[PDB]
Design a protein around this nucleic acid. Structure first.
Ligand SMILES: [Mg+2]
Ligand SMILES: [Mg+2]
Ligand SMILES: [Mg+2]
Ligand SMILES: [Mg+2]
Ligand SMILES: [Mg+2]
Ligand SMILES: [Mg+2]
Ligand SMILES: [Mg+2]
Ligand SMILES: [Mg+2]
Ligand SMILES: [Mg+2]
Lengths: 52, 55, 95, 54, 288, 151
RNA sequence: UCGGAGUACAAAAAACCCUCCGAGUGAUUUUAAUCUAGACAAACCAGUCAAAAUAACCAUAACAUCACUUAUUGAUCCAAAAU
């Protein structure tokens, strides 16, 4: 198995990104993270695939 | 360099006081600087040595 | 370092310094931390902070940088709006 | 209680604070090594520019 | 005075024959001769260094050099194009007025400060002029008409309270150079050039009455000015009713370098004459 | 007598005369909050940290430039900083320049007269440092609740 | 190159083509913020802790956890990304 580095984006409409190691054979990743601009716990959904 | 203007009040706002009309009786005299200040300076050496020069 | 140039016979500056360092007028040099843009996902937030700092160089490095740098860069600068003008004098230093 | 001091004791009223000791800073070094920039502010006297001869 | 003089009667002539440099003035150099300073002569033994070949300055002996492992960051980035304003505290201004270097009677602009050697401009270093800073604000008692290229609220406030007027003017680099050292320019044999305008970044500065900008609408001046009083709590004097008022109101054209001369004239200093163009084109160019 | 295309008159045609900028519009602001001649302003100069204490003093009941409802509401909130001689004392510290201190004082006073002249002020209190106050209050009220007349 | 045990018996440090085990990551959800006193470590570069103060959340709510947990890593420049 390999893991993957994905770029995850905020749904708060604030451009904010953070990268996460995620299982390759798993589903598209979605989390509750902290967005600094809105200063809140918001939903992040993975926008992009950065490193493999 | 212009001789300083006479004022009605001493010391001046910037704190400059002219020398006296007579000179004291002391057996030494300290000339004013060419800019009319008292010639006391500070000096450093080796970064830690602090001195004061009377000229 | 070129100590005597060919055309002018003066002493040249090493520009590779002038891009990564900053000379305050006190003689302290200021630099970024190394690897601060590198592999951020893999690092602690604490470490990331330690990396985002601007830090001071020890005496040896400072003297080395001064030698590698001409007189012009040690001049007293007054910039409008300058962040660092606050830091260029030294205060309360008893040595 | 304010009424007491003025009215009875014929006094001004004393008021106190709670004063904590000023924070401890190491001797300032000529070449602070690997120290954040904000270092130079810990030994700062007061926040105001001062132009010495200028 | 100098009792030393009385010892000189007793002693022989001062001649070229007996003259001593002050002790300590000359530290004698030493040459690699003899048992001490010879035989390897301070160069050590073999290796690279005794032969004089040790590597260049930054080189660390092959490990990636300290000055190159640190990442590039804009620090000095674009430094050459940053504007530089030489600071002048009210303390120095007061001290200059007190000692009669600059006189408050006539208007004070850059040339006046330079001529009293209260300040030094070097345009080549991208000095754009003097800025006024508040160091001596409380102590400042003088009444002045001053023109600087930048100033702080507090500085202005401290000048108004005493019944003077501050104005911020702009000079481009060429203009500035000419302004600071006028007599070297008048020997140059060229006309007096137009004052350039400020660049786009500096327009919002000189258009505001806040800064008492030279390009500002005078309608806002007496308003904004009074505002500065409310803040610092002093009665704003009426400058109109003063005897020196005709001097205090004195401006420059935004296109003019000096007081009382005009773009396009020529100063012949040997004849003590001024020369002005009668041509139409020249007068349209210089007066635009 | 020089003039240019860019001159001050041709840029702003409306205002022209050299005395235009120096007019005093005392009619524009007729409010004159804080008539500084009516304040006692003290300066304690502390040099060593270099800071100059500036002190603004005036009699609260004898001050006519503030309305009566406001003059009474001020003596409530600020009764701590009032003096036994009736004086309201303001003080500023921060800058080495006492212009900035005086300005701090005057701005504080402006603010107090501002909030006191606003009837809409709700005086909202935070629970953070007042929790101890409410609970120790209530709990000395459980004991205070003993009922028999005395004296 | 990195780590654990012995060598190296009790503060630290300490070599060998010395003796022995390992690492170049998984799994999981508790997705693990900003800023800053003081320190550890240290040739330099790098590494480590961390109070108070902010902001997030129970409405006085900041150590990601497990696999011996220690190691699971790589400077500048330069390239791709656009924040
Ligand atoms: Mg010296
Ligand atoms: Mg020699
Ligand atoms: Mg020898
Ligand atoms: Mg021999
Ligand atoms: Mg030999
Ligand atoms: Mg050898
Ligand atoms: Mg200069
Ligand atoms: Mg140690
Ligand atoms: Mg905390």
């Amino acid at each position: 198995s390999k893991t993957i580095l994905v770029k995850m984006m905020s749904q708060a409409g604030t451009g904010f990104s953070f990268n996460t190691k995620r299982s390759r054979l798993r589903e598209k990743l979605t989390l509750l993270h902290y967005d600094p601009v809105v200063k809140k716990k918001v939903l992040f959904v993975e926008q992009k695939k950065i490193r493999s | 360099i212009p001789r300083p203007p006479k004022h009605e009040h001493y010391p001046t706002p910037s704190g400059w006081q002219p020398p006296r009309d007579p000179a004291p009786s002391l057996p030494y005299f300290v000339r004013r600087s060419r800019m009319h200040n008292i010639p006391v300076y500070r000096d450093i050496t080796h970064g830690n040595r602090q001195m004061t020069v009377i000229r | 370092v070129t100590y005597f140039s060919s055309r002018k016979g003066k002493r040249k500056t090493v520009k590779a310094v002038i891009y990564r360092f900053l000379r305050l007028h006190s003689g302290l040099w200021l630099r970024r931390k190394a690897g601060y843009k590198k592999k951020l996902w893999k690092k602690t937030a604490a470490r990331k902070r330690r990396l985002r700092e601007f830090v001071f160089c020890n005496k040896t490095q400072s003297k080395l940088l001064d030698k590698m740098t001409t007189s012009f860069w040690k001049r007293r600068n007054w910039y409008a709006d300058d962040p660092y003008q606050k830091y260029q004098d030294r205060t309360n230093l008893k040595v | 209680v304010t009424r007491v001091f003025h009215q009875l004791l014929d006094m001004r009223e004393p008021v106190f604070e709670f004063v904590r000791p000023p924070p401890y800073h190491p001797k300032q070094k000529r070449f602070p090594h690997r120290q954040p920039l904000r270092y130079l502010d810990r030994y700062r006297d007061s926040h105001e520019p001062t132009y010495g001869i200028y | 005075g100098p009792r030393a003089l009385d010892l000189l009667r007793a002693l022989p002539r001062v001649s070229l024959a007996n003259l001593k440099p002050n002790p300590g003035s000359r530290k004698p150099e030493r040459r690699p001769r003899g048992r001490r300073r010879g035989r390897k002569c301070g160069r050590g033994h073999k290796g690279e260094r005794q032969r004089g070949t040790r590597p260049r300055l930054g080189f660390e002996g092959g490990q990636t050099p300290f000055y190159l492992r640190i990442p590039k960051y804009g620090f000095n980035e674009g430094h050459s194009f940053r504007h530089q304003y030489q600071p002048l505290s009210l303390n120095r201004l007061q001290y200059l007025i007190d000692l009669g270097r600059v006189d408050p009677t006539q208007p004070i602009d850059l040339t006046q400060l330079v001529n009293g050697r209260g300040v030094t401009i070097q345009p080549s270093k991208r000095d754009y002029g003097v800025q006024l800073v508040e160091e001596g604000a409380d102590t400042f008692k003088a009444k002045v008409n001053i023109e600087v290229q930048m100033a702080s609220e507090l500085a202005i406030a401290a000048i108004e309270k005493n019944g003077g007027v501050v104005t911020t003017a702009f000079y481009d680099p060429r203009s500035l150079e000419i302004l600071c050292k006028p007599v070297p320019f008048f020997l140059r044999g060229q006309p007096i050039p137009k004052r350039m305008l400020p660049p786009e970044a500096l327009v919002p500065y000189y258009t505001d009455a806040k800064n008492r900008g030279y390009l500002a609408d005078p309608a806002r001046f007496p308003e904004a000015r009074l505002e500065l009083a409310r803040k610092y709590g002093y009665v704003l004097p009426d400058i109109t009713k003063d005897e020196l008022f005709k001097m205090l109101s004195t401006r420059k054209d935004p296109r003019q370098i000096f007081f009382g001369l005009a773009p396009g004239w020529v100063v012949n200093m040997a004849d003590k004459k001024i020369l002005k163009p009668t041509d139409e084109n020249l007068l349209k160019y210089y007066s635009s | 007598e020089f003039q240019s295309i860019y001159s001050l008159d041709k840029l702003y045609p409306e205002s022209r005369g050299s005395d235009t900028a120096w007019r005093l519009p005392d009619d524009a602001k007729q409010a004159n909050d804080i008539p500084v001649d009516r304040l006692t302003i003290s300066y304690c100069r502390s040099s060593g940290k270099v800071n100059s204490k500036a002190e603004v003093r005036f009699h609260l009941a004898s001050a006519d430039w503030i309305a009566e409802p406001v003059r009474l509401k001020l003596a409530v909130k600020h009764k701590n900083r009032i003096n036994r001689s009736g004086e309201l004392i303001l003080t500023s510290e921060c800058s080495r320049y006492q212009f900035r201190n005086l300005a701090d004082c005057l701005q504080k006073l402006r603010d107090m007269i501002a909030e006191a002249s606003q009837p809409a002020k709700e005086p909202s209190r935070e629970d953070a440092e007042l929790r101890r106050s409410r609970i120790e209050n209530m709990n000395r009220e459980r004991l205070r609740k003993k009922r028999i007349s005395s004296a």
